[PDB]
Design an enzyme around this catalytic site. Structure first.
Site, short mmCIF file in Angstrom:
data_model
loop_
_atom_site.label_atom_id
_atom_site.label_comp_id
_atom_site.label_asym_id
_atom_site.label_seq_id
_atom_site.Cartn_x
_atom_site.Cartn_y
_atom_site.Cartn_z
N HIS A 64 36.04 -52.43 12.41
CA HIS A 64 36.45 -50.91 12.62
C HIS A 64 35.83 -50.12 13.00
O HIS A 64 36.11 -49.07 13.47
CB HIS A 64 37.60 -50.46 11.73
CG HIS A 64 37.17 -50.23 10.31
ND1 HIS A 64 37.84 -50.62 9.02
CD2 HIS A 64 35.88 -49.73 9.91
CE1 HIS A 64 37.18 -50.27 8.00
NE2 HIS A 64 36.11 -49.70 8.32
N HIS A 65 34.12 -50.17 12.78
CA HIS A 65 33.12 -49.54 13.44
C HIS A 65 32.81 -49.76 14.75
O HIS A 65 31.71 -49.43 15.30
CB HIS A 65 32.06 -49.47 12.54
CG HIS A 65 32.45 -49.02 10.92
ND1 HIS A 65 32.59 -47.56 10.63
CD2 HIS A 65 32.98 -49.72 9.90
CE1 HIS A 65 32.84 -47.42 9.29
NE2 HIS A 65 33.31 -48.71 8.78
N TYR A 122 32.91 -48.38 -0.10
CA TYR A 122 33.85 -48.62 -1.31
C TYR A 122 32.79 -48.58 -2.46
O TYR A 122 33.35 -47.90 -3.57
CB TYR A 122 34.43 -49.94 -1.08
CG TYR A 122 35.51 -49.73 0.02
CD1 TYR A 122 36.59 -48.87 -0.11
CD2 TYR A 122 35.29 -50.01 1.28
CE1 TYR A 122 37.55 -48.27 0.91
CE2 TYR A 122 36.26 -49.79 2.31
CZ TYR A 122 37.48 -48.80 2.16
OH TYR A 122 38.10 -48.65 3.25
N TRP A 181 21.77 -43.02 10.79
CA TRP A 181 21.55 -43.65 9.57
C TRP A 181 21.99 -45.34 9.82
O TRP A 181 21.70 -46.02 8.97
CB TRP A 181 22.59 -43.19 8.34
CG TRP A 181 23.59 -43.62 8.19
CD1 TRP A 181 24.81 -43.01 9.06
CD2 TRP A 181 24.43 -44.54 7.35
NE1 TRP A 181 26.34 -43.67 8.81
CE2 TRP A 181 25.74 -44.57 7.63
CE3 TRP A 181 23.91 -45.07 6.10
CZ2 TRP A 181 26.61 -45.26 6.87
CZ3 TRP A 181 24.82 -46.09 5.46
CH2 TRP A 181 26.17 -45.97 5.92
N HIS A 217 19.45 -36.85 6.49
CA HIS A 217 20.57 -36.20 5.82
C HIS A 217 21.50 -37.33 5.16
O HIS A 217 21.71 -37.22 4.06
CB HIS A 217 21.46 -35.35 7.00
CG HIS A 217 22.93 -35.00 6.22
ND1 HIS A 217 22.97 -34.11 5.26
CD2 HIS A 217 24.04 -35.40 6.75
CE1 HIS A 217 24.21 -33.96 4.87
NE2 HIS A 217 25.23 -34.81 5.90
N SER A 247 39.59 -41.43 -13.21
CA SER A 247 40.67 -41.80 -14.11
C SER A 247 40.41 -41.36 -15.50
O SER A 247 41.10 -41.04 -16.27
CB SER A 247 40.69 -43.35 -14.19
OG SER A 247 41.24 -43.84 -13.06
N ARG A 290 29.62 -36.96 18.40
CA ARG A 290 28.54 -36.89 17.47
C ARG A 290 27.07 -36.99 17.81
O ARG A 290 26.95 -37.44 19.10
CB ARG A 290 29.04 -38.40 16.49
CG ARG A 290 30.23 -38.35 15.68
CD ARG A 290 30.27 -39.38 14.83
NE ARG A 290 29.11 -39.71 13.96
CZ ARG A 290 29.12 -40.78 12.96
NH1 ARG A 290 29.89 -41.60 13.22
NH2 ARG A 290 28.18 -40.96 12.20
N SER A 322 16.11 -52.18 -5.48
CA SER A 322 16.52 -51.40 -6.68
C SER A 322 18.15 -51.62 -7.07
O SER A 322 18.41 -51.98 -8.09
CB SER A 322 16.54 -49.86 -6.49
OG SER A 322 16.79 -49.35 -7.33
N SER A 323 19.09 -51.77 -6.24
CA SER A 323 20.50 -51.79 -6.15
C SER A 323 20.89 -53.06 -6.50
O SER A 323 21.69 -53.43 -7.17
CB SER A 323 21.19 -51.16 -5.00
OG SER A 323 21.42 -49.60 -5.29
N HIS A 341 30.73 -51.20 5.70
CA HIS A 341 31.98 -50.77 5.34
C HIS A 341 31.82 -50.99 3.69
O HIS A 341 32.41 -50.10 2.76
CB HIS A 341 33.26 -51.61 5.90
CG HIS A 341 34.48 -50.77 5.34
ND1 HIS A 341 35.07 -49.67 5.47
CD2 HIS A 341 35.01 -51.14 3.93
CE1 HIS A 341 35.82 -49.19 4.68
NE2 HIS A 341 35.90 -50.29 3.73
N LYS A 385 46.64 -46.09 -6.91
CA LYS A 385 45.60 -45.22 -7.84
C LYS A 385 46.08 -43.86 -7.51
O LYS A 385 46.04 -43.25 -8.60
CB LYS A 385 44.17 -45.45 -7.36
CG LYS A 385 43.89 -46.80 -7.48
CD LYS A 385 42.24 -47.29 -7.40
CE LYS A 385 41.41 -46.53 -8.61
NZ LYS A 385 41.91 -47.09 -9.89
N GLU A 437 29.75 -50.67 1.53
CA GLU A 437 28.82 -49.45 1.13
C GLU A 437 29.86 -48.37 0.80
O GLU A 437 29.66 -47.66 -0.04
CB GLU A 437 27.93 -48.97 1.92
CG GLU A 437 27.06 -47.69 1.84
CD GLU A 437 26.44 -48.06 0.36
OE1 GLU A 437 25.86 -46.75 -0.05
OE2 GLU A 437 26.13 -49.09 -0.39
N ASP A 447 22.39 -51.66 -25.42
CA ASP A 447 21.57 -51.36 -24.42
C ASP A 447 22.10 -52.11 -23.04
O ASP A 447 23.16 -52.78 -23.52
CB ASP A 447 19.87 -51.57 -24.41
CG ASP A 447 19.12 -50.64 -23.55
OD1 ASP A 447 18.95 -51.04 -22.27
OD2 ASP A 447 19.13 -49.33 -23.89
N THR A 501 45.02 -48.32 -2.84
CA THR A 501 44.63 -47.28 -3.04
C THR A 501 45.81 -46.01 -3.41
O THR A 501 45.32 -45.33 -4.08
CB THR A 501 43.77 -46.61 -1.53
OG1 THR A 501 42.94 -47.52 -1.15
CG2 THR A 501 42.98 -45.39 -1.95
#
Ligand SMILES: CCCCCCCCCCCCCCCCCC(=O)OCC(COC(=O)CCCCCCCCCCCCCCCCC)OC(=O)CCCCCCCCCCCCCCCCC
Ligand code: HEA
Ligand code: HEA
Ligand SMILES: CCCCC/C=C\C/C=C/C/C=C/C/C=C\CCCC(=O)O[C@H](COC(=O)CCCCCCCCCCCCCCCCC)COP(=O)(O)OCCN
Ligand SMILES: CCCCCCCCCCO[C@@H]1OC(CO)[C@@H](O[C@H]2O[C@H](CO)[C@@H](O)[C@H](O)[C@@H]2O)[C@@H](O)[C@H]1O
Ligand code: CUA
Ligand SMILES: [O-][O-]
Ligand SMILES: [Cu+2]
Ligand SMILES: [Mg+2]
Ligand code: NA
Ligand SMILES: [Zn+2]
Lengths: 514, 43, 75, 93, 104, 144, 46, 71, 84, 259, 57, 49, 227
Positions: free
Chosen positions: A290-291, A244, A126, A61, A255, A438, A156-157, A240, A319, A242, A91, A316
């Protein structure tokens, strides 16, 4: 002709379209996995089987929604369609390598589906923590196919990000400084610098897990002097940044949407919006433990991670408020896209605020590994990253396709989804405070009322998903072709018409240096 | 945004068919598996 | 003797080295008393501390390895 | 010796750009055009190889907003935000 | 700048004898961006400019946008119209209300 | 009147409250009589009729402000239809409860719950505020 | 060179709305159904 | 004749008026929340433990038969 | 620092070749001499079957599953000790 | 007809082949690890090498033979390579992190000390020092090569480049021998794991950088490079310095300080 | 060796509409076909292997 | 001229709402769902030992 | 334990859990205020026909909406970090208990004096006695002395688990090769429940923790009789 166009592409718009299609198909797989979750939990007892099968579902998931849905839509889809248009570029820098970014995802998706088909699946979370993800507690091919899936999505990324950073710095009009590019383009650039720095660290750590599983190394195995917690640091040092990465292109689109349906030529406080994205980016690399606030770290280490994590509220908040100040004085157009963005502003702010509650290591002792976390991150993902995706989709659908959606149906779809996601996730805060852990397939009887409602909200979201598909059908079925779009003067991606020709900006824009 | 009238209008009835076939393409396969879950669990 | 007291050398949540060091100390002390023909009973404090602190499977494994010749700490 | 120079061996677009730069020319739009005064008597002159080109106008120095509009062959057109004048000058390369 | 200097700039803007049709539109479209309803004397100069440009419809449109910029302050537009009435009379400008163009 | 796809690069007409004077006239081709009317507009507007003044307004613009700003009944359709699919969703959950879910655990039977409730009170579950705090241990009943 | 314009910059055809409905049904429905069938696979295994 | 009404800064005036309203509401809410939730909580714990007798609480539980270690 | 040499008027090809042959490659010949000298077999230590060494949680995917990829019989014992 | 200076690339099959070859190699390593077969893997390695060869062949066609690399195109390549190397630095970083985590806090299973009980490290003053002088030397000879090339000197360019390659090859043979000779192995706890994994990825990067220098040697033999335009050579020179800096951090961390 | 760049430039600029990956001539077509055949055949084989590994043996 | 919403709006709304309220009331009370509400003020405690 | 329809935390059973309740109240008040301020400003921006669409100046307003949030964060961090360091203070325990996670049960070891250790497994639903709690009961409870400072040490002998008792504010991960410490003091006698809180395979959901807190003298006799 077909295969040349769609298998051999070197065009940013056609590659952007493929990513959208891929990401929509992943969205349906992700949605099915999420209904299996809520069906298991929708009454007390055991629906599917024990925790192994339940958590293979849970793991896939997450991986499907994050890697195959959100990132490909936002970065591969919107990023490839829009960024070259918005800077008047013909391009991407590396249009051929761009296409290998794309073609690595179907095989990365196949390895994920293989992992779930062989043996008993990877029922690891995950985050794939060992020793549960190790070769004794998860013997056989499923975790290795998972790791390999992530390697390919990673490659890929990282090639995507090099392509985006290069294209954004190197391919603007000669008069345009970086502070004359639109905020969505800034959000892709920052996002890509984060992918570039963080994915190689996850690749190192999942490589060590692969060797621990297959080559007798012991990076994470105390018998050879290794440490399971080292793996967590490696993973999180990526994980972390990831999240953001999942949000920043959503902030960019927001925006653009708010600006556009407020009738505004520009977002409030441009430079503050830039500064905020770069700050959130940077801060997003120094807060990862913090994880880890229950793993047994020294107190000063916990004090520092609590404080470094909290400080992200400041940029944040800039924004959020600049988005409100963009609405201020607007000539407000109540489009379906605007409704998704207004929902974004409010429901992101709620999930960002429970992030801040969780940043407190003292209270996180009791919230950690409970549904409070789950409610936090679905506010920002299901009602934050997803709302931005949906607002971006309905907004730019006419540009990409040359056809219009029916606004009324799209409004109905928003309303159903809004109710479905809130009914799903809101009660999970109660479940979390009251102690539901969890990754559980079943729960002590007292937790029934909220789990029942949460499951019911998940069905309401299902109906919204199926409706969205009929809405996209209807648009293509009816063929109402676009004629005029307003505000093109400050929305360059619309100025080549809908859909723009295959080749745009064959003659660059003319921009005087003055 | 302005646009032209539909080139191939999709009437209320055609929308009902589209919507119905769309809801069923998601409901039926998943309903089939879920309904037979007991048959799977003891097999 | 109720339990192991607070030891300012291991003030944090990870107590793994507290256990290990007291296990070592006890066994170094026995070795040295038994070299110099002494009384092992002076060593008893470290035995109480490592017993209080250490999981039974860890003492049991370390005992087996000292008997096997494969204990990696220095005694 | 033995290593070719760009004069001897550069080809295709690389060559075209390098030869045009020796002549002080910019057919491939590598440089940013300098603004004229932008009045109706002195409009910015916009080369094009067709009969319209998109212009981006940075009305004031350091504006972050660029204002974008098609320039069409014919009478000069004005930036819809600051009214500075532009005029297309088509054909060739 | 003061309120009075702002208004005077705009008056002079629309009073330019050979104001062209582009400057008319640019001035009006810029002006309704601001947090204010234009003074009568600015609307008067914009309405006289419509006359020199032979554009009756844009004069009616200017009246509509005054009313629109006032939002919920329903006292503002009947006041501005009261103040323009000699000008409306002199140029033969019918209001949107007199044209039926305030009906949906 | 007729807007064409291949015109996207040309200035176009829009009705917007905040752009009152759009870049082109809504109607650019004139009939014989529309031409006579534009000539007449060059003389005193007091000599134009009300009908003529309207016809000039309608050549220049498509909708008036009151037309373009009008509210609609769309909300009734959006709210009604949303309730309809939300209502539909309940049919799915009825089917699921009938055909998918089996009996729940015996711990929810009325007599189990009564004993479990006593036992939670005997162990003083949440005696400060959450649970036992709401039981009257003297009167042997729920606080009123 | 390639066809351009509405309906033509996409890998699927939208020439016929009913064939389109079939294709979209298979595409989205196969996505949705896969986890159900993998769950089934796994139950029917051991 | 109609008097001249204000015509300038209408959006800004409305904004000012409502931000101060929002600030006022927010102090008023803080006030209610510290009364209805926070002090309520501190007082429930304080009142509970003030004369709490742990041995008696134990004996009641023991007599109720809840314990493995105490009959 | 600066090391203890000189040139810096121009860093051209002549200089870099001067450094390649007058510093870099002599350093390589020095280290190659030092090494081809301290080389010679160091005496293999007694086998002790430490549980943190010779790890086997899964057979290697080559050979008999029990041998490392660059197994040197002289110096790498198996978990049961040195090979015959 | 464009009037910008950027390269629109002809539709290409190498992305899809490279993607599939990634699928075949990862599927292949699975089958090797779990199903005792090397077939998929061998097929994936093969199509991967074919994809690289044809893709980079074509980049050579586009630039040397077709003239698509205008200064702007070239500048973009420079950003791309610098970014790639950044991401390779972060990848090593995770392995350095693993090394220091284990070695700064040796767990009781190792004896509570580093190097672990029963681990006898190599002497850093022996072949590891040789390896150092070899990679440092090859950085000096490749800078000679780069200046020769700018100076238009064909012969000294090829001599210095050959010398740089032979030194990369010498490093690789020395390292292969050292692997054979080492009394510790990859299965020797976290010491062997961090040693062989970190230096073995470095060895892989040395081979890859050597192959890139060889590609440049044969392009230079065939006169592709002008004295001003030779990005292929610059990229490989930057990659090579990267490989040398990595080794100096391994030497200082794992071989010297971790001994 | 002699500098034959000019010849290759003339070959790769020939106005024949060929994509760069096939412009070298007939060998390019062979290597393409070998590559694509290994990739598609290898891909069908990896699916077969998945089918196999998907069930207990 | 009256659009879809002028003609069908009031009916979509009335009947969407009636149908929603009905089917959810049915689902919630008539098919054996166990909501597990608080025993407080509703359960009479019973001897378990 | 949790009771039906519960909204917030289980009632506190130790001083430190009480402190976490008040700090949560304080933080949630801030959470509610900020999000209701946002929702309110949102409705304010959208409910007027008055417009102001020209460029707006941003350096002034940004000060407020940078400094205010900094201040609110400090007002959160301060009581947050006070509690943090309290949980870390030296406390002198009278008793050390070790617990080892396993798939899928806990074992406890009380070895300050004798070798006492036993395994603690969930009561299967079909064997619950009337009134007992599905998923929460164990055969052998963790009996402990009330009103005493106890040192709990937590580890695992296979995969990760995590040792939690929400009532006391405790959650300490169970990692093999490592020994994590926490301190446990109950203000009251009774039964206090927790559940394994790290995913650990097929029966993660079913290896709960029940503390039984009683007078010292009753704990001593139970210890003796458990030998
Ligand atoms: C869906 C099921 C709900 C079930 C309700 C509870 C039953 C009461 C029983 C009967 C009542 C029994 C009385 C005992 C009280 C014990 C309280 C306690 O121990 O302590 C703590 C409790 C207290 O919780 C509550 O007191 C309920 C809070 C409700 C917040 C407003 C949302 C309500 C809106 C509409 C419906 C919800 C869905 C919308 C969700 C929208 C997402 C915010 O636990 C929480 O932390 C949950 C909140 C998590 C943090 C997210 C907060 C940010 C929210 C946004 C504000 C929106 C602005 C205006 C609000 C905007 C509205 C105009
Ligand atoms: C992007 C991230 C994302 C999203 C959107 C979601 C959406 C949902 N998730 Fe979540 N979830 C995670 C990421 C996400 N989730 C993660 C990371 C975890 C934890 C994993 C772990 O513990 O290891 C998790 C865990 C998690 C759990 C806890 C499992 C447990 O601890 O046992 C639950 C349970 O209710 C849950 C439910 C749902 C539901 C009902 C939704 C629904 O809201 C979904 C409804 C559907 C959509 C939102 C469709 C979205 C978009 C498309 C269909 C594309 C449309 C395409 C175009 C327009 C082009 N999830
Ligand atoms: C798009 C995804 C996304 C985003 C953007 C965020 C943003 C944040 N997250 Fe989130 N988080 C997740 C996704 C996300 N997170 C996921 C998936 C997990 C679980 C991973 C797992 O275990 O599987 C998780 C878990 C997670 C944890 C660990 C909890 C635990 O496991 O015990 C923590 C702890 O600090 C945390 C904190 C934050 C914080 C402070 C932010 C901040 O960036 C939010 C900042 C925003 C605001 C504060 C609102 C806007 C500001 C204002 C209106 C200004 C004024 C505000 C104040 C003064 C406070 N998150
Ligand atoms: C001169 C050095 C040259 C290095 C190349 C050597 C040949 C092996 C090929 C692999 C190259 C990859 C490097 C890193 C991979 C892991 C281990 C490699 C380092 C090495 O070669 O170590 C050898 C172990 O090799 C082993 O296990 C063999 C393992 C061989 C199987 C390779 C593992 C395949 C898995 C790697 C997947 C990589 C995923 C990376 C993705 C990158 C990001 C996308 C050490 O020999 P030993 O007998 O244990 O000790 C010596 C005793 N006298
Ligand atoms: C998590 C998301 C899931 C959403 C819930 C889905 C709700 C709608 C399900 C409808 O699907 C079906 O309904 C059946 C019954 O209603 C089934 O027929 C079965 O039931 C019968 C009635 O007993 C028989 O006629 C048949 O042979 C048959 O196999 C079954 O095949 C299935 O396709
Ligand atoms: Cu043990 Cu989860
Ligand atoms: O990760 O928040
Ligand atoms: Cu985080
Ligand atoms: Mg945890
Ligand atoms: Na369940
Ligand atoms: Zn301008």
């Amino acid at each position: 002709m077909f295969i040349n166009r769609w298998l051999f592409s070197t065009n940013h718009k056609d590659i952007g379209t493929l990513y959208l299609l891929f990401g929509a198909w992943a969205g349906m797989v992700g949605t099915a996995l999420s209904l299996l979750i809520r069906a298991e939990l929708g009454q007390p007892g055991t629906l599917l089987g024990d925790d192994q099968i339940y958590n293979v579902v849970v793991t896939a998931h997450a991986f499907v929604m994050i890697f195959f849905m959100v990132m490909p839509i936002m970065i591969g889809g919107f990023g490839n369609w829009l960024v070259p248009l918005m800077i008047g570029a013909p391009d991407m820098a590396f249009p051929r390598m761009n296409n290998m970014s794309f073609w690595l995802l179907p095989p990365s998706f196949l390895l994920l589906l293989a992992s779930s088909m062989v043996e008993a699946g990877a029922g690891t979370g995950w985050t794939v923590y060992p020793p549960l993800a190790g070769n004794l507690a998860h013997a056989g091919a499923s975790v290795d196919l998972t790791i390999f899936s992530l390697h390919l999505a990673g490659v890929s990324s990282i090639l995507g990000a090099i392509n985006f950073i290069t294209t954004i710095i190197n391919m603007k009009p000669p008069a345009m400084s970086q502070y004359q590019t639109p905020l969505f383009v800034w959000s892709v650039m920052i996002t890509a610098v984060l992918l570039l720095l963080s994915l190689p660290v996850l690749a190192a750590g999942i490589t060590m897990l692969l060797t621990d599983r297959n080559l007798n190394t012991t990076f994470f195995d105390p018998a050879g002097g290794g440490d399971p917690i080292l793996y967590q640091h490696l993973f999180w040092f990526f994980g972390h940044p990831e999240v953001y990465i999942l949000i920043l292109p959503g902030f960019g689109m927001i925006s653009h949407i708010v600006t556009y349906y407020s009738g505004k030529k520009e977002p409030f406080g441009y430079m503050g919006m830039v500064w905020a994205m770069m700050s959130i980016g940077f801060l997003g690399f120094i807060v990862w433990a913090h994880h880890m606030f229950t793993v047994g770290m020294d107190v000063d280490t916990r004090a520092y991670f609590t404080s470094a994590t909290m400080i992200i509220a400041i940029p944040t908040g800039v924004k959020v408020f600049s988005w409100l100040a963009t609405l201020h004085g607007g000539n407000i157009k109540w489009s379906p896209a605007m409704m998704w963005a207004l929902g974004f502003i409010f429901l992101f702010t709620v999930g960002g605020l429970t992030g801040i509650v969780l940043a407190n290591s003292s209270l996180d002792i009791v919230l950690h590994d409970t549904y409070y976390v789950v409610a936090h991150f679905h506010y920002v993902l299901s009602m934050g990253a997803v709302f931005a995706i949906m607002g971006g989709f309905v907004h730019w659908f006419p540009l990409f396709s040359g056809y219009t959606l029916n606004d009324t149906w799209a409004k109905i779809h928003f309303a159903i989804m809004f109710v479905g996601v809130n009914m799903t996730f809101f009660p999970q805060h109660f479940l979390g405070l009251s102690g539901m852990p969890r990754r559980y397939s079943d729960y002590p009887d007292a937790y029934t009322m909220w789990n029942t409602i949460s499951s019911m909200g998940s069905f309401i979201s299902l109906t919204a998903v199926m409706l969205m598909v009929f809405i996209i059908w209807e648009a293509f079925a009816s063929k109402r072709e676009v004629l005029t779009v307003d505000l093109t003067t400050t929305n360059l991606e619309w100025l080549n018409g809908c859909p723009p020709p295959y080749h745009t900006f064959e003659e660059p824009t003319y921009v005087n240096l003055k | 945004i302005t646009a032209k009238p539909a080139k191939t209008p999709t009437s209320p009835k055609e929308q009902a068919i589209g919507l119905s076939v769309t809801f069923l393409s998601f409901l039926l396969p998943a309903g089939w598996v879920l309904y037979h879950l007991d048959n799977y669990k003891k097999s | 003797y109720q339990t192991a007291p607070f030891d300012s050398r291991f003030p944090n949540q990870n107590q793994t080295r507290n256990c290990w060091q007291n296990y070592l100390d006890f066994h170094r002390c026995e070795k040295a008393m038994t070299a110099k023909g002494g009384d092992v009973s002076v060593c008893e404090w470290y035995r109480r501390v490592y017993k209080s602190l250490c999981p039974i499977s860890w003492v049991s494994t370390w005992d087996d390895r000292r008997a096997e010749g494969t204990f990696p700490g220095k005694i | 010796g033995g290593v070719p120079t760009d004069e001897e061996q550069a080809t295709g677009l690389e060559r075209e750009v390098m030869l045009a730069a020796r002549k002080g020319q910019d057919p491939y739009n590598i440089l940013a055009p300098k603004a004229t005064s932008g009045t109706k008597e002195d409009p910015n002159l916009v080369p094009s190889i067709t009969n319209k080109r998109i212009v981006g106008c940075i009305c004031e120095e350091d504006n972050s907003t660029v204002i974008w509009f098609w320039l069409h062959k014919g009478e000069a057109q004005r930036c819809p935000s600051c009214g500075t004048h532009y005029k297309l000058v088509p054909h060739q390369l | 700048e003061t309120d009075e200097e702002f208004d005077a700039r705009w008056v002079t803007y629309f009073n330019k004898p050979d104001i062209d049709a582009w400057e008319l539109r640019k001035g009006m479209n810029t002006l309704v961006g601001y947090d204010l309803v234009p003074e009568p004397k600015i609307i008067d100069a914009a309405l006289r400019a419509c006359r020199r440009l032979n554009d009756f419809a844009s004069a009616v449109r200017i009246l509509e946008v005054v009313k629109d910029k006032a939002g919920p302050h329903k006292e503002i537009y009947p006041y501005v119209i009261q103040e323009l009435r000699p000008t409306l009379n002199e140029l033969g400008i019918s209001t949107p209300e007199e044209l039926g163009l305030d009906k949906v | 009147s007729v807007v064409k796809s291949e015109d996207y690069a040309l200035p176009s007409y829009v009705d917007r409250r905040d752009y009152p004077l759009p870049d082109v006239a809504h109607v650019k081709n004139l009939s014989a009589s529309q031409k006579a009317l534009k000539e007449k507009e060059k003389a005193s507007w007091s000599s134009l009729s009300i009908d003529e003044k309207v016809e000039l307004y309608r050549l220049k613009f498509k909708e008036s402000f009151a037309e373009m700003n009008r509210s609609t009944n769309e909300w009734k359709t959006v709210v009604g239809a949303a309730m309809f699919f939300i209502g539909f969703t309940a049919l799915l959950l009825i089917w699921e409860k009938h055909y998918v879910y089996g009996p729940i655990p015996h711990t929810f039977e009325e007599e189990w719950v009564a004993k479990q409730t006593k036992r939670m009170l005997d162990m003083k579950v949440a005696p400060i505020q959450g649970f036992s705090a709401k039981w009257d241990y003297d009167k042997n009943e729920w606080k009123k | 060179h390639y066809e351009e314009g509405p309906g033509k910059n996409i890998p699927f055809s939208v020439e016929n709305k009913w064939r389109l409905l079939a294709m979209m049904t298979l595409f989205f429905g196969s996505g949705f159904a896969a986890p159900f069938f993998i769950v089934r696979h796994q139950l029917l295994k051991k | 004749a109609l008097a001249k009404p204000q015509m300038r800064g209408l959006l800004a005036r409305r904004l000012r008026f409502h931000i101060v309203g929002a600030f006022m509401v927010s102090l008023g809410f803080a006030t209610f929340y510290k009364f209805a939730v926070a002090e309520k909580r501190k007082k429930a714990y304080a009142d509970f433990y003030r004369n709490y007798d742990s041995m008696k609480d134990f004996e009641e539980m023991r007599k109720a038969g809840i314990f493995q270690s105490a009959k | 620092a600066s090391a203890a040499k000189g040139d810096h008027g121009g860093t051209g090809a002549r200089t870099w070749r001067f450094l390649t042959f007058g510093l870099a490659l002599p350093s390589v010949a020095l280290c190659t001499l030092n090494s081809w000298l301290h080389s010679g077999h160091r005496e293999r230590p007694a086998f002790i079957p430490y549980h943190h060494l010779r790890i086997r949680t899964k057979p290697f995917s080559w050979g008999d599953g029990n041998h490392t990829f660059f197994h040197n019989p002289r110096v790498n014992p198996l978990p049961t000790g040195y090979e015959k | 007809h464009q009037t910008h200076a950027y390269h629109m690339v002809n539709p290409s099959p190498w992305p899809l082949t490279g993607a599939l070859s990634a699928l075949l190699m990862t599927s292949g390593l699975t089958m090797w690890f779990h199903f005792n077969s090397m077939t998929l893997l061998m097929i994936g390695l093969t199509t991967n090498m074919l994809t690289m060869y044809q893709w980079w062949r074509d980049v050579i066609r586009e630039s040397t033979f077709q003239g698509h690399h205008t200064p702007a195109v070239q500048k973009g390549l420079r950003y791309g390579m610098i970014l790639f190397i950044i991401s390779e630095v972060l990848f090593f970083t995770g392995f350095f992190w693993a090394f220091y985590h284990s070695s700064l806090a040796p767990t009781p299973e190792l004896g509570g000390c580093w190097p672990p009980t029963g681990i006898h490290p190599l002497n850093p003053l022996e072949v590891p020092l040789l390896n150092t002088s070899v990679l440092l030397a090859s950085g000096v000879s490749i800078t000679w090569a780069h200046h020769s090339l700018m100076e238009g000197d064909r012969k000294h360019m090829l001599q210095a480049l050959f010398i740089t390659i032979t030194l990369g090859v010498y490093f690789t043979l020395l390292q292969a021998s050292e692997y054979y000779e080492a009394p510790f192995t990859i299965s020797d706890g976290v010491y062997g794991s961090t040693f062989f994994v970190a230096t073995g990825f470095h060895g892989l990067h040395v081979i890859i950088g050597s192959t890139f220098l060889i590609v440049c040697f044969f392009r230079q033999l065939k006169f592709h490079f002008t004295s001003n335009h030779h990005f292929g050579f610059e990229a490989a020179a930057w990659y090579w310095h990267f490989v040398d800096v990595v080794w100096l951090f391994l030497y200082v961390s794992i071989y010297w300080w971790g001994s | 060796f002699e500098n034959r760049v000019a010849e290759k430039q003339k070959l790769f600029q020939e106005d024949n509409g060929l994509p760069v990956h096939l412009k070298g001539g007939a060998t390019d077509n062979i290597l393409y076909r070998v590559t694509m055949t290994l990739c598609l055949g290898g891909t069908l084989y990896s699916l077969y292997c998945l089918g196999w590994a998907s069930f207990p043996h | 001229a009256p659009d879809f919403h002028d003609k069908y709006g009031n009916a979509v709304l009335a009947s969407g709402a009636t149908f929603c309220v009905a089917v959810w009331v049915y689902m919630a009370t008539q098919i054996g769902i166990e909501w597990n509400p608080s025993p407080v003020g509703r359960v009479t405690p019973k001897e378990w030992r | 334990m949790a009771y039906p329809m519960q909204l917030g935390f289980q009632d506190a059973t130790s001083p430190i859990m009480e402190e976490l309740l008040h700090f949560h109240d304080h933080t949630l008040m801030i959470v509610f205020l900020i999000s209701s301020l946002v929702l309110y400003i949102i409705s304010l921006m959208l409910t007027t026909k008055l417009t102001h669409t020209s460029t707006m100046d941003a350096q002034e307003v940004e000060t407020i909406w940078t400094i205010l949030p900094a201040i609110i964060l400090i007002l959160i961090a301060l009581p947050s970090l006070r509690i943090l360091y309290m949980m870390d203070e030296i406390n002198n325990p009278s008793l050390t208990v070790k617990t080892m996670g396993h798939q899928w049960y806990w074992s406890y070891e009380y070895t300050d004096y004798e070798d006492l250790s036993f395994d603690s497994y969930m009561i299967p639903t079909s064997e619950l006695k009337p009134g007992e709690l599905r998923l929460l009961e164990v055969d052998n409870r963790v009996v402990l002395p009330m009103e005493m400072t106890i040192r709990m040490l937590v580890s695992s002998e296979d995969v990760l688990h995590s040792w939690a008792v929400p009532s006391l504010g405790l959650k300490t991960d169970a990692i093999p090769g490592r020994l994590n410490q926490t301190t446990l003091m109950s203000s009251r006698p009774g039964l206090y429940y927790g559940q394994c809180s790290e995913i650990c395979g097929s029966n993660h959901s079913f290896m709960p923790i029940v503390l039984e807190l009683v007078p010292l003298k009753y704990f001593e006799k139970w210890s003796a009789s458990m030998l």
